[PDB]
Automatic annotation (TrEMBL), chain B:
<protein>
    <recommendedName>
        <fullName>Large ribosomal subunit protein uL15/eL18 domain-containing protein</fullName>
    </recommendedName>
</protein>
<comment type="similarity">
    <text>Belongs to the universal ribosomal protein uL15 family.</text>
</comment>
UniProtKB/TrEMBL annotation, chain C:
<protein>
    <recommendedName>
        <fullName>Large ribosomal subunit protein uL4m</fullName>
    </recommendedName>
</protein>
<comment type="similarity">
    <text>Belongs to the universal ribosomal protein uL4 family.</text>
</comment>
From TrEMBL, chain D:
<dbReference type="GO" id="GO:0005840">
    <property type="term" value="C:ribosome"/>
</dbReference>
<dbReference type="GO" id="GO:0017148">
    <property type="term" value="P:negative regulation of translation"/>
</dbReference>
<dbReference type="Pfam" id="PF00572">
    <property type="entry name" value="Ribosomal_L13"/>
</dbReference>
<keyword id="KW-0689">Ribosomal protein</keyword>
<dbReference type="GO" id="GO:0020023">
    <property type="term" value="C:kinetoplast"/>
</dbReference>
From TrEMBL, chain E:
<protein>
    <submittedName>
        <fullName>Uncharacterized protein</fullName>
    </submittedName>
</protein>
RNA sequence: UAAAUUAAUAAAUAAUUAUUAAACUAAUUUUAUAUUAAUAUUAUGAAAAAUUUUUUUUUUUUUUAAUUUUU
C-alpha cells in the first residue's frame, strides 16, 4: 500500500466505546437512519443547544470559552474544598484562572518570572542578597 | 466582459502577454507603407525560409 | 530571466537630465505608436521632395 | 532538557493501571500519550508529551502461552552472540523490561528515523511493578480507556 | 489520438479572449455636439442581471409582452443602483423602447429611446456602441410610426460610426494569429483561424443593419439616390473592415520546433488602419537633440551638453598607423570645418 | 544537453564543504536534491501530510467520545461540506465550534433533504387563449418568483426601499416608464 | 450578501416539518441489490446523495455559486474555466436528449426489438427465457 | 537458481520467524510442529 | 494597495530617445497615457540616456523596490509588467501552501488548551438505573424473583430428569 | 436577529454580538475569516483596492454561538478589500528522467491575491428550537431548562467500568443562557 | 511500440518506425474509429515436451481521492 517499504504515517485510532443504551429507543443500530454513527454525550453536552434556522442550518448556542474554563476550575478546585492539595493541582488551577481571563498564551514562557525572582524567595547570606531597594 | 465601466477588469499578465518581442515588420507591413523599411535589417528574406538546419 | 531583481537603476534622478512624467497632455522625445528602430522626423532625415510622403498621395512628387 | 522541540509546559500526568490489561495493548495507548498523539495540537516536530505512570506492571496479561513462546531476541556484535529470551525469561530479570520493550516497539513505529525522537518519548513512561510510586504529588489522573 | 470530451474539458487559452475595451467619444466631443456636426449601496445586481437576460431571451422569443415586464423591473433597479444618467441606466431603456415598440406602444417608445440620449450627451464620454444602439431605436420607432421624414437618422447614425469608430482595434490581435500554426496537414485548421467582425465588433454589426434598414426605406418609397447613398456606404463600411484583417502568408509548410517564435507572432501589431493613419511621415517622432549627440548641419549647438570639451579631430581610423599614414589625412580636418560652418 | 547550470550555480552557496566549492560536484548534488523535492512533492508529500491532518481532527474527536471513523461519515450525512483541513482548523482554533459540530452529528436531527429536480409549474400546461395584450400565465408567476428572491437576498435598502414597497407593484415597474 | 442556491430555480424543499411533527430521515443503507451484506452509505455516497458529485468541488453549490462579488452587488464576469463548465453541463443534456431522440425514432418506427438482449447475451445467460 | 519461497519480514520479535515465510500457500500458515530456540 | 493608499510610489524607467528596440518608446505613446490615468499618484520617473538599462523598476513606500527585465520585451509586455509593480506590495515572499493561506491566525474563541475538555466525561441520554445497587420498587421485586424463579425452576427441573427419566 | 418567538429574540439577540468569524469557500479552498485578516486566495479578477464580498459561506461563529449552515449559510455578510495581486514564491521543479538526455526546468509561481477583510456581520432568522437527541422542533423555548439533560453512565453492573477522577464522575451542566 | 519473410517463365503491396503530404460516400447511435501516397529504415538472434496477476516509468502548484486487518 503506497510504497510498500513500510507505513509510518500516523494512523487513526479506533473509536471509543459508546455510552450505555439505557433507553431502548434503538440506541443499538448503525445501519439505521434515525441517527448518525457518532455518539457524543458528555458532561456538558446539554449546554450546546441548537435552534433550527430557516435556511437549513442550525444556530447552536454554546457557552463561551471563558465559561467552560470557569466550570472546569469550579470542578477542579472543589475536588476537595477542604481536602488534600497537589503540586500538580495548584499549578493547574493557577493556569485555569490565567486561561479564564484573556487566554492569549503569554508569548514568552511560564517560568521566566520565578527563575528571576528567586532571590527574595531564597535567603543567601544577606551580604550577598537582593533587596528591592539596594542599600 | 465587465458588467459596467465602474468595475473595470484588472491587468494581470500571463505568459501569452508578458513575454513577447517587438513586432519586426512583416512583408505586408512594408507593402502597405514603405516608410518602415528604414534600414537593411528590415529587408528580411523569404518567410518560407525558416532558418538554417 | 527576471533574475537581477534589484541593483539596476539607482533610486534617484540624474542632475538636470531626468524628467518625471507630467501627464498624457505633453509628449516625450521619441514616443510613437509604431515600432521604429531608426526613428526619424522631417528634420533629421529630411526627404528632398515637393510634398511629404503620405498614404494619401501615392508619392511625394508632382 | 529545555531544548526547543521539548514542551514541558502543558504537561498532563496520566496513570494507566496495567492490572489485567494485555501487555501488547497497554503499550499502545501509553504511546499515543507519550508521543502526544492524543493532542489536537500534535505536530511531528514538537514532542509535546504527557507523562504516563503505568503502575501495577506485574499484573499484566499475555493471551495464551505467549508467556512461553514469544522471544525478546537481540543479536550482539560478538559472533555467536545471538540471544533468545522468552518473556517468562526476561520476566525473571525485570518485569518492567518487558513493558519497556513493548513500548519501544510502539514509539519506534512512528519515530525510528531520528534518535532524538526514538528515545525522548520513552523517558515519559514510569513503569512501576506495584502500587507504590513517588508521584503522588504529580496527581496522576487515571486515564479512561476500553480496549 | 482524439479527445472524447466526455469529461469536463477545461478551456483552452487563445488571444481571441482578450478583454477588448469599450468604445467612446474623444475627450471634449459631446454627442449632441457631435451629431449636429453632421461607493455605492448594495443592490442585488447579480440577481437582476439574471432577470434581464430572461428579457433578452424573451424579447428574442416573440414574447414581447412578458419581456416588457422583466425589462421593467431591471430598468427600475438600475435607476436606483447607478446614479443619474449613468452609461448603464441609459442603456437598459434601449431594451425597453424596443420592447415597447414591439407592443404597439410606440408613443412611449420614442418617449424612451429619446430619454436615453440626454443621459448620453450629458455624460463625459459615452459608450459609442450605445449611441449607435439608441440612434437605431430612434430610427426604428420612427418606422413603426410610419414617418418617412423620420427615416434619415440611420444615415446620420452611421455618420458617427464612420467618424468615431476606429475600425482597427476590433481585429488588432486576431490579425497575425494565422501565423501561429506550424503544421500543414494535421491540426492545420489553425492557419485559417477566422474571427468574424459581425461577431466581434458589435458597433460594426449594428452599423450594418442601420445601412440595411435604411436601404429598405428608400427601396420601399421607390427612392433611387437614397438606395445608392446607402449601398455604397454599406460597402465602404465593410471594405475598411476586411482591409484591417488582410495579411500575407508567412511560412506555409510544417515548420518544426521553433516554438520560441511564439513571441514575434502574437504581439501588439500595428493594424493596417493605423500603420497609415499614424505614418512616420505624417505623424513625426519628436526627437529632442537635448538628449542626443547629433543634429543637422546647422543646429550644432543644441546637442546634449557636456563639460570642458574640445573637438580633437575626426576619428579617422588611420590616425593609429604610422606617421606616413597620418601625413595623409592632414587637411581632412581643416576641409571638414567650413562644411559644418554657416 | 542543458543542465540548467546557470540557475543551479547560485544555489551552490547553501551546500556543505565540497558541493559549495567545486562547481561540478555541486551540480550533481543540487540537481539531485531539486530533482527529489519535485519527486517528493508530486508523489509522496500528499499521502503523508494528508494523514497528519486526519490524525489531528481525529485526536480532537476522541476528546468527545467519537472518532474520524464516525465523524467522517456524519460530516457528510449532514451535508456539512467541510474540507478535512478545515476540521483541523476548527479543532485547534475554534474548539467550541468543532464541539458544536460533534454534537450535531451525534444528534438525531434530520439532515437537509436532497436538492430537488426541476418541477414543471402547472401554468405551463394551462392552455393559453388567443390574447396578445396580457403576458403568458407562467411568466407572471416566474417573474414574481424572481423578484421575491431578489428582495429576500441581503438587506439592501433599495434607496431605503424607494423602489415599489410591495411586490405586485415591483412587477409593474414597466408602467413607470409609460406616459 | 451571501448566497445559497443549490438548484437552478432554488425553490428548496424546507426541511423543518412543524413544531411537533416527526423528522423523516433518509435511509442510510446503500442500495445493495442482494441485501445480505447490509452496508451503509460511506461519506462519498452521502456526498453523491446530497446533490454533489463524487467530490464536492463538482456539480454542486461549490462551483455554481460565484466565489465573490463586488460590495455594491455587481457580479463578476465569466472565465475560461466557467464557460467551459456551462458548455459541459449543456453537453450532459445534449448527450441525453439526442440519446432519447434516437430512441424515440426507433420506437416510433418500431425498430427497437422485442427479444430482450443481444444474440450473444441470450446465448450466454440462461435466466433470459427462450423465444 | 530458481528462487522459491520468498520471505516478507514484518518486524521482529512480533513475527515469530515462521510467519515471515508464511503468506505463501503451503503447509506453512500452520504452527511449527517442533521449534528450536 | 493598502487602505486605499498605493504601496507604489514611483516607477523608474530608462530608455533611449533614438537608438532602437522601440517597444519602450512605443509604450510611451499608447499605454502609458492610459496607465497614468488610473494611478496618477504613481510618479513615473522616465530617464533618457544613451546606453539604456533594460529594466523597469518600482519604488515602494517602505524603501523596497523591484526590477523587471524588459530586454527584447514588446510594448504589450511592458505595460503588463508596468501594471504588476503597482499591484504587489513587496512585503513577503510567501509560498502559497496550505499553511500560509492565512497570514494572521487569530482565533476568536480562544485556542484549544489541555484544560478545556479535560474534566468532561461520558454520560447517558435518559437516566440510567444504578441497577447494581438500587432499592427496588415493589413491582421490580415481583419481576426479578419471577425471572430468577423461572430460572431456578428450570435448573432443578432437569437435574432430577437426569436420574428419574433413567427409571421412569 | 430576526425571529418569530419574542422570547428567543430577547435571549439569542445578545449572543450574536461581539467579534465574529466565518469560514468561506473561495477558489476551492476554505478560509477561516474574521474582521481583520488577510488571506491569500487563488487569483481573483478584482482590481486592487476595490471592495469585494464573498458569496459562499459555510459557518459563522462567535464567542458563544456558531451558525452551522449545512451546505451554506444564507444572509451572512463578509466583505473584503483586495490589497495585493501578486505572484507568490516560486516552486521550482526539475523533470529529467535518467535515460533521456533532457532536463525540463518547470518553474511555476502561484498567482494569489491578498484580501484584507473589513467586517463580518450576521443576522439570522430562526424557526424555533429543536432538541438534539430527538431532532424534532420544540413548541416553546425556556431560556433556562436544557431541552434534554444528561446523566451518568456508571450503572455499577460493569465490574471494570473505568473510573475517572471522583469529581469527573459527578458534575452538573451549568445554566449558560443567563 | 515484435512486427515482418516464397532465389530462380504472365500471380495487387515485406514489415516497422520516421519525415513530408492526401481524401469521406451504398457502410445506423444525432456512437466511435490514424485510412492513403512519396521518401528514409531490412541482423537483436530460442532448443525440447504439452496442445488441436496488473495498467503502469512519468507528473506545472495548491487542495481534493472510493482497494486494511492474525493466529
Amino acid at each position: 500500500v503506497y510504497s510498500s517499504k513500510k507505513d509510518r504515517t500516523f494512523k487513526v485510532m479506533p473509536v471509543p466505546p459508546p455510552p450505555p443504551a439505557t433507553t431502548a429507543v434503538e440506541q443499538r443500530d448503525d445501519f439505521a437512519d434515525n441517527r448518525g454513527l457518532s455518539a457524543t454525550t458528555r458532561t456538558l453536552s446539554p449546554t450546546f443547544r441548537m435552534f433550527a434556522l430557516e435556511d437549513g442550518g442550525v444556530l447552536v448556542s454554546h457557552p463561551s470559552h471563558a465559561q467552560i474554563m470557569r466550570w472546569n476550575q469550579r470542578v477542579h478546585t472543589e475536588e476537595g474544598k477542604a481536602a488534600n492539595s497537589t503540586v500538580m493541582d495548584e499549578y493547574v488551577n493557577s493556569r485555569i484562572q490565567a486561561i479564564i481571563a484573556d487566554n492569549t498564551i503569554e508569548n514568552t514562557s511560564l517560568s521566566q518570572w520565578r527563575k528571576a525572582h528567586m532571590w527574595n524567595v531564597i535567603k543567601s547570606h544577606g551580604k550577598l542578597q537582593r533587596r528591592w531597594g539596594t542599600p | 466582459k465587465e458588467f459596467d465601466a465602474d468595475h473595470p477588469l484588472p491587468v494581470v499578465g500571463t505568459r501569452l502577454n508578458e513575454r513577447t518581442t517587438t513586432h519586426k515588420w512583416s512583408h505586408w507591413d512594408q507593402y502597405i507603407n514603405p516608410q518602415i523599411t528604414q534600414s537593411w535589417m528590415y529587408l528580411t528574406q523569404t518567410p518560407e525560409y525558416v532558418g538554417p538546419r | 530571466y527576471d533574475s537581477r531583481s534589484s541593483g539596476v537603476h539607482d533610486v534617484a534622478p540624474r542632475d538636470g537630465v531626468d524628467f518625471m512624467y507630467e501627464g498624457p497632455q505633453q509628449v516625450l522625445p521619441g514616443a510613437h505608436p509604431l515600432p521604429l528602430f531608426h526613428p526619424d522626423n522631417s528634420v533629421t532625415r529630411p526627404p528632398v521632395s515637393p510634398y511629404l510622403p503620405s498614404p494619401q498621395r501615392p508619392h511625394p512628387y508632382f | 532538557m529545555s531544548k526547543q522541540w521539548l514542551c514541558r509546559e502543558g504537561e498532563r500526568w496520566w496513570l494507566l493501571d496495567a492490572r489485567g490489561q494485555q501487555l501488547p495493548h497497554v503499550a499502545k495507548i501509553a504511546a499515543q500519550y507519550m508521543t502526544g498523539q492524543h493532542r489536537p495540537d500534535f505536530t511531528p516536530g514538537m514532542m509535546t508529551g504527557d507523562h504516563v505512570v503505568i503502575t501495577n506492571i506485574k499484573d499484566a496479561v499475555m493471551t495464551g502461552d505467549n508467556w512461553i513462546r514469544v522471544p525478546i531476541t537481540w543479536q550482539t556484535a560478538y559472533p555467536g552472540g545471538k540471544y533468545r529470551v522468552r518473556l517468562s525469561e526476561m520476566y525473571e530479570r525485570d518485569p518492567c523490561m518487558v513493558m519497556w520493550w513493548y513500548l519501544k516497539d510502539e514509539v519506534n513505529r512512528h519515530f525510528v528515523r531520528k534518535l532524538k525522537t526514538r528515545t525522548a518519548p520513552l523517558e515519559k513512561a514510569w513503569l512501576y511493578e506495584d502500587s507504590v510510586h513517588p508521584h503522588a504529588e504529580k496527581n496522576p489522573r487515571p486515564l479512561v480507556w476500553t480496549d | 489520438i482524439t479527445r472524447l470530451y466526455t469529461s469536463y474539458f477545461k478551456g483552452e487559452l487563445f488571444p481571441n479572449q482578450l478583454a477588448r475595451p469599450l468604445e467612446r467619444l474623444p475627450r471634449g466631443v459631446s454627442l449632441a455636439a457631435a451629431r449636429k456636426g453632421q461607493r455605492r449601496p448594495y443592490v442585488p445586481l447579480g440577481e437582476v442581471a439574471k432577470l434581464e437576460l430572461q428579457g433578452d431571451y424573451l424579447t428574442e422569443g416573440g414574447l414581447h409582452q412578458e419581456a416588457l415586464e422583466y425589462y421593467g423591473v431591471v430598468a427600475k433597479a438600475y435607476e436606483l443602483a447607478y446614479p443619474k444618467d449613468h452609461p448603464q441606466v441609459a442603456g437598459i431603456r434601449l431594451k425597453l423602447a424596443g420592447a415597447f415598440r414591439r407592443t404597439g406602444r410606440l408613443t412611449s417608445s420614442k418617449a424612451n429611446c429619446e430619454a436615453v440620449l440626454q443621459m448620453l450627451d450629458s455624460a463625459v464620454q459615452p459608450p459609442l456602441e450605445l449611441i449607435v444602439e439608441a440612434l437605431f431605436e430612434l430610427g426604428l420607432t420612427s418606422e413603426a410610426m410610419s414617418d418617412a421624414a423620420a427615416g434619415t437618422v440611420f444615415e446620420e447614425a452611421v455618420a458617427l460610426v464612420d467618424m468615431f469608430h476606429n475600425s482597427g482595434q476590433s481585429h488588432k490581435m486576431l490579425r497575425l494569429l494565422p501565423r501561429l500554426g506550424r503544421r500543414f496537414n494535421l491540426n492545420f485548421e489553425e492557419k485559417f483561424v477566422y474571427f468574424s467582425p459581425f461577431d466581434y465588433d458589435r458597433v460594426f454589426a449594428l452599423a450594418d443593419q442601420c445601412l440595411e434598414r435604411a436601404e429598405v426605406f428608400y427601396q420601399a418609397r421607390n427612392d433611387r439616390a437614397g438606395v445608392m447613398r446607402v449601398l455604397q456606404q454599406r460597402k465602404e463600411l465593410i471594405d475598411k473592415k476586411f482591409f484591417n484583417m488582410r495579411d500575407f502568408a508567412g511560412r506555409i509548410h510544417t515548420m518544426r520546433g521553433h516554438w520560441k517564435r511564439r513571441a514575434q507572432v502574437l504581439t501588439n501589431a500595428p493594424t493596417p488602419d493605423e500603420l497609415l493613419r499614424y505614418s512616420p511621415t505624417i505623424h513625426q517622432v519628436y526627437r529632442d537633440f537635448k538628449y542626443e549627440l547629433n543634429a543637422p548641419i546647422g543646429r550644432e549647438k543644441e546637442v546634449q551638453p557636456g563639460v570642458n570639451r574640445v573637438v580633437h579631430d575626426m576619428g579617422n581610423p588611420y590616425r593609429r598607423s604610422g606617421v606616413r599614414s597620418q601625413r595623409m589625412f592632414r587637411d581632412a580636418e581643416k576641409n571638414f570645418e567650413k562644411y559644418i560652418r554657416a | 544537453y542543458y543542465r540548467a547550470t546557470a540557475e543551479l550555480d547560485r544555489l551552490r552557496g547553501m551546500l556543505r564543504g565540497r558541493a559549495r566549492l567545486e562547481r561540478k560536484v555541486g551540480l550533481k548534488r543540487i540537481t539531485f536534491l531539486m530533482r527529489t523535492q519535485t519527486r517528493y512533492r508530486v508523489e509522496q508529500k500528499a499521502h503523508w501530510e494528508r494523514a497528519i491532518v486526519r490524525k489531528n481532527v481525529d485526536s480532537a474527536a476522541h476528546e468527545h467520545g467519537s472518532g474520524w471513523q464516525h465523524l467522517r461519515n456524519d460530516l457528510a450525512r449532514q451535508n456539512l461540506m467541510l474540507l478535512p483541513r478545515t476540521q483541523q482548523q476548527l479543532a485547534q482554533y475554534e474548539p467550541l465550534a468543532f464541539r458544536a459540530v460533534m454534537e450535531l452529528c451525534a444528534s438525531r436531527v434530520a439532515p437537509p433533504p436532497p436538492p430537488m429536480t426541476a418541477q414543471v409549474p402547472e401554468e405551463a400546461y394551462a392552455t393559453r387563449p388567443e390574447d396578445p395584450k396580457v403576458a403568458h400565465p407562467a411568466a407572471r408567476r416566474q417573474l414574481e418568483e424572481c423578484v421575491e428572491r431578489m428582495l429576500c437576498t441581503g438587506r439592501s435598502d433599495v434607496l431605503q426601499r424607494e423602489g415599489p414597497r410591495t411586490t405586485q407593484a415591483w412587477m409593474d415597474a414597466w408602467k413607470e416608464y409609460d406616459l | 450578501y451571501s448566497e445559497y442556491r443549490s438548484s437552478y430555480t432554488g425553490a428548496r424543499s424546507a426541511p423543518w416539518a412543524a413544531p411537533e411533527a416527526a423528522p423523516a430521515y433518509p435511509s442510510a443503507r446503500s442500495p445493495f441489490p442482494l441485501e445480505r451484506p447490509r452496508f451503509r452509505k460511506t461519506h462519498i455516497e452521502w456526498m453523491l446523495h446530497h446533490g454533489h458529485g463524487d467530490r464536492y468541488g463538482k456539480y454542486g453549490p461549490s462551483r455554481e455559486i460565484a466565489d465573490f462579488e463586488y460590495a455594491d452587488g455587481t457580479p463578476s464576469s465569466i472565465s475560461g474555466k466557467r464557460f467551459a463548465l456551462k458548455h459541459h453541463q449543456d453537453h450532459l443534456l445534449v448527450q441525453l436528449i439526442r440519446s432519447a431522440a434516437i430512441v424515440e425514432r426507433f420506437e416510433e418506427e418500431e425498430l427497437l426489438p422485442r427479444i430482450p438482449g443481444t444474440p450473444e447475451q441470450r446465448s450466454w445467460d440462461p435466466e433470459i427465457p427462450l423465444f | 537458481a530458481a528462487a522459491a519461497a520468498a520471505a516478507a519480514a514484518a518486524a521482529a520479535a512480533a513475527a515469530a520467524a515462521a510467519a515471515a515465510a508464511a503468506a505463501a500457500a503451503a503447509a506453512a500458515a500452520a504452527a511449527a510442529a517442533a521449534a528450536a530456540a | 494597495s493598502r487602505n486605499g493608499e498605493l504601496c507604489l510610489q514611483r516607477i523608474i524607467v530608462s530608455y533611449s530617445p533614438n537608438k532602437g528596440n522601440p517597444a519602450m518608446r512605443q509604450f510611451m505613446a499608447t499605454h502609458l497615457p492610459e496607465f497614468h490615468r488610473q494611478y496618477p499618484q504613481v510618479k513615473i520617473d522616465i530617464r533618457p540616456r544613451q546606453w539604456p538599462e533594460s529594466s523597469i523598476t518600482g519604488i515602494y513606500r517602505d524603501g523596497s523596490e523591484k526590477a523587471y527585465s524588459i530586454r527584447f520585451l514588446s510594448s504589450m509586455g511592458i505595460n503588463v509588467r508596468f501594471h504588476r509593480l503597482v499591484n504587489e506590495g513587496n512585503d513577503y515572499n510567501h509560498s502559497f501552501s496550505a499553511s500560509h493561506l492565512h497570514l494572521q491566525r487569530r482565533s476568536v474563541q480562544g485556542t484549544w488548551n489541555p484544560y478545556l475538555w479535560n474534566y468532561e466525561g461520558t454520560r447517558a441520554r435518559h437516566k440510567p438505573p444504578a441497577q447494581w445497587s438500587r432499592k427496588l420498587t415493589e413491582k421490580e421485586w415481583d419481576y426479578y424473583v419471577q425471572q430468577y424463579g423461572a430460572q431456578m425452576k428450570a435448573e432443578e427441573d432437569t437435574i432430577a430428569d437426569r436420574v428419574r427419566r433413567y427409571t421412569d | 436577529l430576526r425571529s418569530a418567538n419574542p422570547t428567543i429574540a430577547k435571549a439569542l439577540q445578545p449572543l450574536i454580538e461581539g467579534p465574529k468569524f466565518a469560514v468561506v469557500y473561495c477558489g476551492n479552498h476554505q478560509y477561516k475569516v474574521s474582521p481583520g485578516d488577510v488571506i491569500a486566495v487563488q487569483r481573483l479578477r478584482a482590481p486592487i483596492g476595490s471592495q469585494i464580498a464573498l458569496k459562499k459561506v459555510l459557518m459563522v461563529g462567535g464567542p458563544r454561538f456558531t451558525a452551522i449552515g449545512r451546505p451554506l449559510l444564507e444572509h451572512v455578510r463578509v466583505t473584503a478589500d483586495v490589497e495585493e495581486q501578486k505572484r507568490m514564491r516560486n516552486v521550482v521543479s526539475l523533470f529529467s528522467t535518467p535515460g533521456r538526455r533532457r532536463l525540463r526546468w518547470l518553474d511555476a509561481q502561484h498567482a494569489a491575491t491578498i484580501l484584507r477583510i473589513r467586517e463580518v456581520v450576521y443576522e439570522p432568522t430562526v424557526v424555533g428550537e429543536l432538541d438534539k437527541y430527538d431532532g424534532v422542533l420544540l413548541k416553546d423555548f425556556h431560556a433556562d431548562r436544557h431541552p434534554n439533560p444528561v446523566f451518568t453512565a456508571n450503572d455499577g453492573y460493569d465490574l471494570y467500568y473505568p473510573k475517572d477522577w471522583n469529581k469527573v464522575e459527578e458534575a452538573s451542566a451549568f445554566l449558560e443562557m443567563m
